[PDB]
């Protein structure tokens, strides 16, 4: 394919489910799946912001079938901010408000 000029990718379509998105727990490995089957042919990335405390790491893998597995680990508790972008865009729901007990 030389030219494309077709296939607009939308973020509002990208859906996400799980706990990590809603809330997380120190030590506990929070994971969340992102469906992009009817979203677009764009790339999926993450930008875990560190407004209060940084994260241990971020495991991102494209299990396929239009599913992206992303898991992380925290060390401190409080108010967190999850930033998920979808090919130069921001999924519907971010920045998400994650509260850790």
Curated annotation (Swiss-Prot):
Post-translational modification: ISGylation prevents ability to interact with the upstream activators of the JNK cascade and inhibits IFNA-induced JNK signaling.
Stretches the record annotates as Interaction with FLNA 2: 8-101
Modified sites of kind N6-acetyllysine: 75
Region entry Self-association site, tail, spans: 8-101
Residues bearing the modification N6-succinyllysine: 17, 23
Filamin repeats: 8-100
Tissues/organs with expression: Ubiquitous. Isoform 1 and isoform 2 are expressed in placenta, bone marrow, brain, umbilical vein endothelial cells (HUVEC), retina and skeletal muscle. Isoform 1 is predominantly expressed in prostate, uterus, liver, thyroid, stomach, lymph node, small intestine, spleen, skeletal muscle, kidney, placenta, pancreas, heart, lung, platelets, endothelial cells, megakaryocytic and erythroleukemic cell lines. Isoform 2 is predominantly expressed in spinal cord, platelet and Daudi cells.
Subunit structure: Homodimer. Interacts with MICALL2. Interacts with RFLNA and RFLNB. Isoform 1 interacts with FBLP1, FLNA, FLNC, GP1BA, INPPL1, ITGB1A, PSEN1 and PSEN2. Isoform 3 interacts with ITGB1A, ITGB1D, ITGB3 and ITGB6. Interacts with MYOT and MYOZ1. Interacts with HBV capsid protein. Interacts with ASB2 isoform 1; the interaction targets FLNB for proteasomal degradation.
The record's note on its domains: Comprised of a NH2-terminal actin-binding domain, 24 internally homologous repeats and two hinge regions. Repeat 24 and the second hinge domain are important for dimer formation. The first hinge region prevents binding to ITGA and ITGB subunits.
Function: Connects cell membrane constituents to the actin cytoskeleton. May promote orthogonal branching of actin filaments and links actin filaments to membrane glycoproteins. Anchors various transmembrane proteins to the actin cytoskeleton. Interaction with FLNA may allow neuroblast migration from the ventricular zone into the cortical plate. Various interactions and localizations of isoforms affect myotube morphology and myogenesis. Isoform 6 accelerates muscle differentiation in vitro.
Protein family (similarity comment): Belongs to the filamin family.
Disorder this protein is connected to according to its UniProt record: Interaction with FLNA may compensate for dysfunctional FLNA homodimer in the periventricular nodular heterotopia (PVNH) disorder. Atelosteogenesis 1: A lethal chondrodysplasia characterized by distal hypoplasia of the humeri and femurs, hypoplasia of the mid-thoracic spine, occasionally complete lack of ossification of single hand bones, and the finding in cartilage of multiple degenerated chondrocytes which are encapsulated in fibrous tissue.
Protein name in UniProt: Filamin-B
Origin species: Homo sapiens (Human)
């Amino acid at each position: 394919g030389s030219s494309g000029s077709s296939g607009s990718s939308d973020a509002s379509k990208v859906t996400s489910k799980g706990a990590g998105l809603s809330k997380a727990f120190v030590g506990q490995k929070s994971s969340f799946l992102v469906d992009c089957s009817k979203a677009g042919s764009n790339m999926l990335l993450i930008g875990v912001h560190g407004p209060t405390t940084p994260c241990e790491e971020v495991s991102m893998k494209h299990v396929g079938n239009q599913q992206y597995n992303v898991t992380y680990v925290v060390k401190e508790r409080g108010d967190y901010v999850l930033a998920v972008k979808w090919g130069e865009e921001h999924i519907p729901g971010s920045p998400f408000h994650v509260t850790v007990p």
